[PDB]
Design an enzyme around this catalytic site. Structure first.
Site, PDB file in Angstrom:
ATOM      1  N   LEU A  22       0.804  -1.214   0.000  1.00  0.00           N
ATOM      2  CA  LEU A  22       0.000   0.000   0.000  1.00  0.00           C
ATOM      3  C   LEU A  22       0.829   1.251   0.000  1.00  0.00           C
ATOM      4  O   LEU A  22       2.000   1.222   0.490  1.00  0.00           O
ATOM      5  CB  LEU A  22      -0.930  -0.022   1.238  1.00  0.00           C
ATOM      6  CG  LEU A  22      -1.951  -1.142   1.152  1.00  0.00           C
ATOM      7  CD1 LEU A  22      -2.904  -1.001   2.177  1.00  0.00           C
ATOM      8  CD2 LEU A  22      -2.662  -1.218  -0.194  1.00  0.00           C
ATOM      9  N   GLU A  30      -8.573   0.543   9.453  1.00  0.00           N
ATOM     10  CA  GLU A  30      -9.009   0.504   8.055  1.00  0.00           C
ATOM     11  C   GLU A  30      -8.959  -0.931   7.562  1.00  0.00           C
ATOM     12  O   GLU A  30      -9.891  -1.459   6.937  1.00  0.00           O
ATOM     13  CB  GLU A  30      -8.179   1.494   7.263  1.00  0.00           C
ATOM     14  CG  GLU A  30      -8.954   2.062   6.033  1.00  0.00           C
ATOM     15  CD  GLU A  30      -9.220   1.107   4.882  1.00  0.00           C
ATOM     16  OE1 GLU A  30     -10.334   1.047   4.339  1.00  0.00           O
ATOM     17  OE2 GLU A  30      -8.229   0.339   4.559  1.00  0.00           O
TER      18      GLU A  30
HETATM   19  N1  LIG Z   1      -5.521   0.050  -1.772  1.00  0.00           N
HETATM   20  C1  LIG Z   1      -6.222  -0.991  -2.147  1.00  0.00           C
HETATM   21  O1  LIG Z   1      -7.450  -1.078  -1.851  1.00  0.00           O
HETATM   22  C2  LIG Z   1      -5.629  -2.076  -2.962  1.00  0.00           C
HETATM   23  C3  LIG Z   1      -4.266  -2.040  -3.252  1.00  0.00           C
HETATM   24  N2  LIG Z   1      -3.706  -2.970  -4.079  1.00  0.00           N
HETATM   25  C4  LIG Z   1      -2.297  -2.762  -4.415  1.00  0.00           C
HETATM   26  O2  LIG Z   1      -2.213  -2.789  -5.790  1.00  0.00           O
HETATM   27  C5  LIG Z   1      -1.007  -3.617  -6.216  1.00  0.00           C
HETATM   28  C6  LIG Z   1      -1.530  -4.859  -6.970  1.00  0.00           C
HETATM   29  O3  LIG Z   1      -2.433  -4.518  -8.020  1.00  0.00           O
HETATM   30  P1  LIG Z   1      -2.119  -4.583  -9.521  1.00  0.00           P
HETATM   31  O4  LIG Z   1      -0.674  -4.255  -9.689  1.00  0.00           O
HETATM   32  O5  LIG Z   1      -3.169  -3.844 -10.203  1.00  0.00           O
HETATM   33  O6  LIG Z   1      -2.201  -6.149  -9.858  1.00  0.00           O
HETATM   34  P2  LIG Z   1      -3.363  -7.301  -9.878  1.00  0.00           P
HETATM   35  O7  LIG Z   1      -3.635  -7.688  -8.529  1.00  0.00           O
HETATM   36  O8  LIG Z   1      -4.479  -6.913 -10.736  1.00  0.00           O
HETATM   37  O9  LIG Z   1      -2.520  -8.503 -10.533  1.00  0.00           O
HETATM   38  C7  LIG Z   1      -2.238  -8.439 -11.947  1.00  0.00           C
HETATM   39  C8  LIG Z   1      -2.060  -9.871 -12.436  1.00  0.00           C
HETATM   40  O10 LIG Z   1      -3.308 -10.555 -12.161  1.00  0.00           O
HETATM   41  C9  LIG Z   1      -3.777 -11.306 -13.335  1.00  0.00           C
HETATM   42  N3  LIG Z   1      -4.993 -10.706 -13.757  1.00  0.00           N
HETATM   43  C10 LIG Z   1      -5.497  -9.459 -13.456  1.00  0.00           C
HETATM   44  N4  LIG Z   1      -6.722  -9.367 -13.949  1.00  0.00           N
HETATM   45  C11 LIG Z   1      -7.039 -10.532 -14.555  1.00  0.00           C
HETATM   46  C12 LIG Z   1      -8.162 -10.945 -15.259  1.00  0.00           C
HETATM   47  N5  LIG Z   1      -9.245 -10.155 -15.340  1.00  0.00           N
HETATM   48  N6  LIG Z   1      -8.176 -12.239 -15.717  1.00  0.00           N
HETATM   49  C13 LIG Z   1      -7.062 -13.013 -15.579  1.00  0.00           C
HETATM   50  N7  LIG Z   1      -5.921 -12.628 -14.928  1.00  0.00           N
HETATM   51  C14 LIG Z   1      -5.936 -11.369 -14.421  1.00  0.00           C
HETATM   52  C15 LIG Z   1      -2.588 -11.252 -14.177  1.00  0.00           C
HETATM   53  O11 LIG Z   1      -1.819 -12.363 -13.963  1.00  0.00           O
HETATM   54  P3  LIG Z   1      -1.166 -13.310 -15.102  1.00  0.00           P
HETATM   55  O12 LIG Z   1      -0.097 -12.542 -15.766  1.00  0.00           O
HETATM   56  O13 LIG Z   1      -0.671 -14.482 -14.345  1.00  0.00           O
HETATM   57  O14 LIG Z   1      -2.254 -13.681 -16.103  1.00  0.00           O
HETATM   58  C16 LIG Z   1      -1.997  -9.917 -13.949  1.00  0.00           C
HETATM   59  O15 LIG Z   1      -0.597  -9.858 -14.399  1.00  0.00           O
HETATM   60  C17 LIG Z   1      -0.259  -3.862  -4.989  1.00  0.00           C
HETATM   61  O16 LIG Z   1       0.580  -2.677  -4.727  1.00  0.00           O
HETATM   62  C18 LIG Z   1      -1.348  -3.897  -3.919  1.00  0.00           C
HETATM   63  O17 LIG Z   1      -0.826  -3.609  -2.632  1.00  0.00           O
HETATM   64  C19 LIG Z   1      -4.427  -4.037  -4.651  1.00  0.00           C
HETATM   65  C20 LIG Z   1      -5.806  -4.111  -4.324  1.00  0.00           C
HETATM   66  C21 LIG Z   1      -6.410  -3.079  -3.557  1.00  0.00           C
HETATM   67  C1  LIG Z   2      -6.884  -7.118  -0.725  1.00  0.00           C
HETATM   68  C2  LIG Z   2      -6.640  -5.787  -1.524  1.00  0.00           C
HETATM   69  C3  LIG Z   2      -7.286  -4.593  -0.751  1.00  0.00           C
HETATM   70  S1  LIG Z   2      -8.902  -4.112  -1.010  1.00  0.00           S
HETATM   71  C4  LIG Z   2      -8.812  -3.000   0.262  1.00  0.00           C
HETATM   72  N1  LIG Z   2      -9.913  -2.205   0.631  1.00  0.00           N
HETATM   73  C5  LIG Z   2      -9.714  -1.464   1.681  1.00  0.00           C
HETATM   74  N2  LIG Z   2     -10.753  -0.712   2.157  1.00  0.00           N
HETATM   75  N3  LIG Z   2      -8.539  -1.358   2.352  1.00  0.00           N
HETATM   76  C6  LIG Z   2      -7.369  -2.043   1.942  1.00  0.00           C
HETATM   77  O1  LIG Z   2      -6.332  -1.836   2.576  1.00  0.00           O
HETATM   78  C7  LIG Z   2      -7.574  -2.980   0.901  1.00  0.00           C
HETATM   79  C8  LIG Z   2      -6.710  -3.911   0.273  1.00  0.00           C
HETATM   80  S2  LIG Z   2      -4.990  -4.162   0.711  1.00  0.00           S
HETATM   81  C9  LIG Z   2      -5.119  -5.325   2.059  1.00  0.00           C
HETATM   82  C10 LIG Z   2      -6.288  -5.513   2.704  1.00  0.00           C
HETATM   83  C11 LIG Z   2      -6.339  -6.454   3.743  1.00  0.00           C
HETATM   84  C12 LIG Z   2      -5.186  -7.174   4.073  1.00  0.00           C
HETATM   85  C13 LIG Z   2      -5.246  -8.226   5.153  1.00  0.00           C
HETATM   86  O2  LIG Z   2      -4.172  -8.731   5.595  1.00  0.00           O
HETATM   87  N4  LIG Z   2      -6.427  -8.557   5.648  1.00  0.00           N
HETATM   88  C14 LIG Z   2      -6.583  -9.620   6.676  1.00  0.00           C
HETATM   89  C15 LIG Z   2      -6.262  -9.107   8.056  1.00  0.00           C
HETATM   90  C16 LIG Z   2      -7.169  -7.958   8.529  1.00  0.00           C
HETATM   91  C17 LIG Z   2      -6.628  -7.222   9.780  1.00  0.00           C
HETATM   92  O3  LIG Z   2      -5.451  -6.846   9.792  1.00  0.00           O
HETATM   93  O4  LIG Z   2      -7.474  -6.835  10.505  1.00  0.00           O
HETATM   94  C18 LIG Z   2      -8.032 -10.043   6.628  1.00  0.00           C
HETATM   95  O5  LIG Z   2      -8.868  -9.382   5.942  1.00  0.00           O
HETATM   96  O6  LIG Z   2      -8.343 -11.105   7.244  1.00  0.00           O
HETATM   97  C19 LIG Z   2      -3.994  -6.958   3.447  1.00  0.00           C
HETATM   98  C20 LIG Z   2      -3.980  -6.047   2.409  1.00  0.00           C
END
Ligand SMILES: NC(=O)C1=CN([C@@H]2O[C@H](COP(=O)(O)OP(=O)(O)OC[C@H]3O[C@@H](n4cnc5c(N)ncnc54)[C@H](OP(=O)(O)O)[C@@H]3O)[C@@H](O)[C@H]2O)C=CC1
Ligand SMILES: CCc1sc2nc(N)[nH]c(=O)c2c1Sc1ccc(C(=O)N[C@@H](CCC(=O)O)C(=O)O)cc1
EC number: 1.5.1.3
Length: 186
Positions: A22, A30
């Protein structure tokens, strides 16, 4: 199967990730919000399903994977089987959603939660039908290398209240944030 949902936390500059984690330091309450929303199911004998890309799977600390109490599905076209600790593998979002309709999952899955990353959020947000977005607005800019897609507010209404979601400004580690729920139906 029940409702389809995205959940994310995003900075002011739309960042969701940096260097595989993150952009901000850990916000423990959160994270607990994420776990309460994604785990809590109102329907007896069912669990919620989480759908995530492969990099998002590996970004979760290994001690916290699979996300407990939820069915964990990973999207990848390169993997041949679910990662260690994961439950399912699909090669597309449409495939994953169809899987929930199969006999192994049909009566087990309540809510579906898409938990990123950017490509799957974008495709889900633009797929016709009923969808909600649970967005945590982290109210600072953070250097990021992964971004949330555009929320089209012509279709996604910001809801003026939602049971169980606090409405006021939260703060942890000097970082203010607030919770929002959006809904479309098209
Ligand atoms: N703040 C938040 O709420 C969240 C933060 N994050 C952050 O974002 C980063 C990760 O996200 P991001 O980089 O976008 O990567 P993704 O998690 O989307 O992973 C990308 C890989 O997933 C596969 N993939 C993605 N979409 C599809 C699809 N629709 N069908 C098939 N395969 C798929 C591919 O793998 P392959 O090449 O094997 O086909 C692709 O190379 C991290 O930094 C994480 O911490 C992630 C979620 C939420
Ligand atoms: C999974 C990717 C996403 S979607 C998302 N949405 C909101 N609101 N906040 C986030 O931070 C994330 C994230 S990044 C993330 C989220 C949860 C966790 C995690 O370790 N969750 C565990 C532990 C939760 C805890 O620490 O309380 C769980 O859901 O059981 C790690 C990375």
């Amino acid at each position: 199967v029940g409702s389809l949902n995205c959940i994310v936390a995003v900075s002011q500059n739309m960042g969701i990730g940096k260097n595989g984690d993150l952009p901000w330091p850990p916000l423990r309450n959160e994270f607990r919000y994420f776990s309460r929303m994604t785990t809590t199911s109102s329907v007896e004998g069912k669990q919620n399903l989480v759908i995530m890309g492969k990099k998002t799977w590996f970004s979760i600390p290994e001690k916290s994977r699979p996300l407990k109490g939820r069915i964990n599905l990973v999207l990848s076209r390169e993997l041949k089987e679910p990662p260690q600790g994961a439950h399912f593998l699909s090669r597309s979002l449409d495939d994953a959603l169809k899987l929930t309709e199969q006999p192994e999952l049909a009566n087990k899955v309540d809510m579906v939660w898409i938990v990123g990353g950017s490509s799957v959020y974008k495709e889900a947000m633009n797929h016709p039908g009923h969808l909600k977005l649970f967005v945590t607005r982290i109210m600072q800019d953070f250097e990021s290398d992964t971004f949330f897609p555009e929320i089209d507010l012509e279709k996604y209404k910001l809801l003026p209240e939602y049971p169980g979601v606090l409405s006021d400004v939260q703060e942890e580690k000097g970082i203010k944030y607030k919770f929002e729920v959006y809904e479309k139906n098209d």
